[PDB]
Design a protein around this ligand. Structure first.
Ligand SMILES: OC[C@H]1O[C@H](O)[C@H](O)[C@@H](O)[C@@H]1F
Ligand code: NA
Lengths: 579, 106, 30
């Protein structure tokens, strides 16, 4: 409906032709900048656009801390976790845990858990975001949009558009950043510039605030007005929607799982030619992670300014007519800005950019999940599996998880307040912190053994489920309709719960490990951070040596370290600037 | 219910002079102010909204400014046709409220 | 109050002080 003009159809078709042509033409080596671009492209998908813009429209600046916190955890990956992964000679994170602790249950459990996390927070989220973009562009329902997105994804995979070339994610990162820059320029032009956004945001509210539902009736000002601390990154510890202690500590835990314990990102970073290239790509990715504040969040705030009756709908029936979700319609923030603000031709370009972000993230996720199932689940049951059956099983597993994610999609649309990023980060905060705790204790506390690790993972799963299940079962509330969560189980912010779950999992891990037999030191050479440069042979629980070498020349190591310090100082300045 | 106050009920300027019509909100509206012009026999027409954004078609003589609670509409070169009633409206909250209206005469 | 650039510079000063502290800890007793 909105891309029905010849210019939009032409630009979309040109992008599809280029993608199909490059995919059909396809018929440890990466240097630092491909590594950084790959990390950024794998991380940033259409879910990031939808969620960051929606939370910026709904709440303001603080959501940028979800991307700005990633600089420090990417430096953790480059300087603490990547060395250990490279010296351990691992291809999957469950494989590292298998080397570190032994046994076969931690690897299997972590594979299954990671696949569930990909279905929940990664695949279904991206499918939902693409469907929302198709809804705004074509005026379709959510299910026609999902079917269309599945069809185009099937075309992408059949034509081979998800194949990984040497500089594919570099081009994807360039296209994402260029499209986001064009839309950011148009959006800032609409509001009268950078200062126009901050002039206008706090006054932008919908004029439709009375509901015909007698239970709702007059909706309070607190529910439709922009938050008073909308321009502040650091918000109140108990009343803030993103309290600063939770945004700085629990978000560090969740981001640490995301960047240092997760196959999607680590599989990209482990392709670096050297450790200096991995560290420099970490610096580049961290610098690129400062961009979603101005390319996603502030455009979402501008979207609230421009379309307050749609993006900031408060009345449940008005919201149901706007986006189909009665609890809020902020997810259409970036979609609407693409279709209502971009002119003919550039609107199709922005749709192509969103599809490119979606497809780069999906390529990373599909590769990682197929690898996980193939090497950590399937090959355990079929050790004699040939390459052909492994490849076929991987493709079929990818198809299976895509179907399962589409099945899960109703939960994703039932995000709390109708905010996708809240759903992503809450599920991450309920399921990830046990993995963060176990990976940290594995890397840095050699006394932790297989018993402590596995039972910390299981106990963390139990304690995080005692939060996840009531959160979903009680339904999706909003400010207008708050839902019947007991408010001791859901009143606490999910990043505070990430802190609590991380510390409870670490405590259970340490306590079970200290009550059982320790792992002898000879089994932990080059597996713990304490023994990266250990040259002894280890009892596992030429070319390979060059694969497992993390010795870097002092000059470029010093240059990379100084650039990491400079990037941290720039990030700290930005944190203070918007504090 | 926000109260918009126009301190001067009446302003007289010669043709070619610059006139500033002031509006004061009862609270801090985040530049959420519109200016309307109503000529004697006609209905109001939007000049400005967001306190500075000119409506489509209004001349560059009409310039809005202000922040917090204090807003102004300036006519840089008043023409003999500029005599009218100028209203400030807040679009910060609902119900929309208007200023009393300042009558610009020549 | 403080301008946002003044807050940023204060944050950078705190970061550099912490960097010096971490370097001293690294140099003296690992
Ligand atoms: O869940 C934590 C993650 O949340 C989002 O995906 C951010 O873009 C990542 O930087 C962060 F690591
Ligand atoms: Na992506």
């Amino acid at each position: 409906a909105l891309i029905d003009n010849p210019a939009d159809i032409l630009v979309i078709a040109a992008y599809f032709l280029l993608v199909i042509g490059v995919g059909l033409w396809s018929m440890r080596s990466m240097v630092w900048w491909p590594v950084g671009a790959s990390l950024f492209a794998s991380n940033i998908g259409s879910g990031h656009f939808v969620g960051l813009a929606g939370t910026g429209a709904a709440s303001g600046l603080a959501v940028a801390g979800f991307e700005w916190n990633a600089l420090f955890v990417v430096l953790l990956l480059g300087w603490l976790f990547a060395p250990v992964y490279l010296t351990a000679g691992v291809i999957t994170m469950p494989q590292y845990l298998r080397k570190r602790f032994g046994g076969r249950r931690i690897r299997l459990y972590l594979s299954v858990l990671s696949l569930f996390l990909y279905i929940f927070t990664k695949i279904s989220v991206d499918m939902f975001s693409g469907a929302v973009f198709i809804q705004q562009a074509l005026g379709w329902n959510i299910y026609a949009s999902v079917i269309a997105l599945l069809g185009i994804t099937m075309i992408y995979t059949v034509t081979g558009g998800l194949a990984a070339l040497m500089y594919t994610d570099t081009v994807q990162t360039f296209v994402i950043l260029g499209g986001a820059c064009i839309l950011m320029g148009y959006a800032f032009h609409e509001v009268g510039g950078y200062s126009g956004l901050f002039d206008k945001y706090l006054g932008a509210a919908t004029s439709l605030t009375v509901s015909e539902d007698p239970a709702v009736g007059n909706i309070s000002s607190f529910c439709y007005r922009p938050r008073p601390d909308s321009y502040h990154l650091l918000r109140h510890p108990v009343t803030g929607d993103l309290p600063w202690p939770a945004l700085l500590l629990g978000l560090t835990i969740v981001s640490g799982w995301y960047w240092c314990s997760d196959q999607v990102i680590v599989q990209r970073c482990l392709a670096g030619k050297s450790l200096t290239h991995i560290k420099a790509g970490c610096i580049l990715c961290g610098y690129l992670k400062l961009t979603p504040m101005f390319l996603m969040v502030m455009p979402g705030m501008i979207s609230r300014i421009l379309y307050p009756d749609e993006v900031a709908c408060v009345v449940p029936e008005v919201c149901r007519r706007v986006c189909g979700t009665e609890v809020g319609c902020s997810n259409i923030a970036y979609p609407r800005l693409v279709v209502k603000l971009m002119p003919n031709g550039l609107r199709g370009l922005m749709l192509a950019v969103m599809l490119a972000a979606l497809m780069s993230s999906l390529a990373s996720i599909f590769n990682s999940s197929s690898t996980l199932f193939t090497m950590d689940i399937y090959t355990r049951l079929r050790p004699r599996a040939g390459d052909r059956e492994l490849l076929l099983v991987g493709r079929l597993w990818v198809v299976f998880i895509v179907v399962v994610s589409v099945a899960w999609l109703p939960v994703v649309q039932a995000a709390q307040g109708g905010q996708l990023f809240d759903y992503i980060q809450a599920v991450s905060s309920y399921l990830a912190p046990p993995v963060s705790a176990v990976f940290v204790l594995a890397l840095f506390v050699p006394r932790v053994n297989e018993q402590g690790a596995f039972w910390g993972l299981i106990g963390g799963l139990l304690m995080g489920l005692a939060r996840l299940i009531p959160e979903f079962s009680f339904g999706s509330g909003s400010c207008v309709q708050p839902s019947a969560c007991p408010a001791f189980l859901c009143g606490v912010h999910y990043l505070y719960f990430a802190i609590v779950l991380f510390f409870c999992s670490g405590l259970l891990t340490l306590t079970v490990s200290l009550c059982t037999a320790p792992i002898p030191r000879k089994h932990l050479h080059r597996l713990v951070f304490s023994l990266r440069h250990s040259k002894e042979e280890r009892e596992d629980l030429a070319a390979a040596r060059r694969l497992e070498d993390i010795s870097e020349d002092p000059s470029w190591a010093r240059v990379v370290n100084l650039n990491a310090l400079l990037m941290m100082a720039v990030a700290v300045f930005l944190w203070g600037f918007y504090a | 219910x926000x109260x918009x106050x126009x301190x001067x009920x009446x302003x007289x300027x010669x043709x070619x002079x610059x006139x500033x019509x002031x509006x004061x909100x009862x609270x801090x509206x985040x530049x959420x102010x519109x200016x309307x012009x109503x000529x004697x026999x006609x209905x109001x027409x939007x000049x400005x909204x967001x306190x500075x954004x000119x409506x489509x078609x209004x001349x560059x003589x009409x310039x809005x400014x202000x922040x917090x609670x204090x807003x102004x509409x300036x006519x840089x070169x008043x023409x003999x046709x500029x005599x009218x009633x100028x209203x400030x409206x807040x679009x910060x909250x609902x119900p929309x409220x208007x200023x009393x209206x300042x009558x610009x005469x020549x | 109050n403080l301008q946002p650039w003044m807050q940023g510079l204060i944050a950078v000063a705190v970061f550099l002080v912490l960097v010096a502290i971490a370097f001293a800890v690294n140099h003296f007793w690992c």
